[PDB]
Design a binder for this molecule. Sequence first.
Ligand code: HEM
Length: 451
Amino acid sequence: MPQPKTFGELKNLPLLNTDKPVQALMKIADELGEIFKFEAPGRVTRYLSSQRLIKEACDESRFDKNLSQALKFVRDFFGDGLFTSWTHEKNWKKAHNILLPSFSQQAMKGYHAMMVDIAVQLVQKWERLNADEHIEVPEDMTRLTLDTIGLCGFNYRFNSFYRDQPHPFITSMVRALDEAMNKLQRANPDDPAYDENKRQFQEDIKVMNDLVDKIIADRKASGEQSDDLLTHMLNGKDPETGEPLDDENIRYQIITFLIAGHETTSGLLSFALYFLVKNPHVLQKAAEEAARVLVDPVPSYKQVKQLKYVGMVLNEALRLWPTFPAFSLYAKEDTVLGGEYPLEKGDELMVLIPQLHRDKTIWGDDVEEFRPERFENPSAIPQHAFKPFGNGQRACIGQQFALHEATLVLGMMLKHFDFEDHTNYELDIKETLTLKPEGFVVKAKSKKIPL
Ligand code: HEM
């Protein structure tokens, strides 16, 4: 099996001592091909990049979700929430069954009004800019997506658009995820030099956990008859065990949904707008759909479902830059991958989603081009070729929520504004386990359509 350059007794570990590890891993994959071994002290994994091999890795009878080294570190705050629990933990399947009804079609129609509430605040912010003022795109998209999960999921208002600086929850969430990414490259984690990093880390987690207490305390005290994600967490019973979630698991789910429910979606909207302003003919086509379909001051749920081309733009943005770029798997038993790489039970794999999404045998030769038309008929895509939301029973539970929000917001953006890439921005991808085009700015000129 191919393997990139090694560093003596540190093996390949120094290759991930960079600000852009995923981007470093993609270039290794370009150099070495569909599979490559990556060793660290006392650790080994195999990075897969081709649909040929990933279609076997997505075989659930042979491989199950692994918690990567990164996810093990985040589990200190995510606990046994849906995202950081093993498939075999009781709390995974319980919460899985209890919370899927929160993403039913009827649940989605119920979220739509509060999504519009936040989308209108975004549009109003941009409409209220003075001449020649610009937009900080990932910053405002994070304002929107954080507020949307807070309100739709928990009837809690982060009021991000009333702030020039990030919400304290996000300040502690980013620093706590920074501490988790730095534990990967640190030899002796229980050494006195990191005594204060750990002090910071645990105070950043109590910031996040104090908000959680408030969301819970205000639901119990509230009179309003709510039917949202928190309703199901507090009241839903698992049809299989007959049990509801317990108090400590509930806290983990709230923290999980608040973080997983906004970061990757903000990344998606950021990349989508980036590709639109870089591809003016695509932007014009998407804008024409938005104008044709969104005939009312606020979009209906049905109208969002009719934004076919906008949906295609979002999928094409997810192909080039899947915002959660790598997922980890482990072999359920001894097995042979691709008829030439034998694996033993427990052997770990990493699916490099951006490399899978550039497989020339599936997508053709123009893999770097932004062409939404490749999603004209989504059924034409072979199995396991397009995986921005993961695999099987461990796939993203919030997929339809993220895509409905992103389609709604992007449709309104295209309806209400013309956009200008006034700095001719140079794509610079920031990695914090998720991806975002750092420093992306635009100018918007309103088409002066009332809300
Ligand atoms: C474009 C936006 C999103 C992307 C690209 C994305 C990506 C993913 C991926 C790749 C996984 C599988 C993780 C793994 O295999 O380790 C996943 C799982 C998950 N996502 Fe998302 N996600 C997005 C939005 C959301 C939203 C909006 C929510 C909540 C409302 C959410 C909540 C979760 C949860 C709880 C899981 C774990 C599910 C389980 O294992 O049962 N995500 N997501």
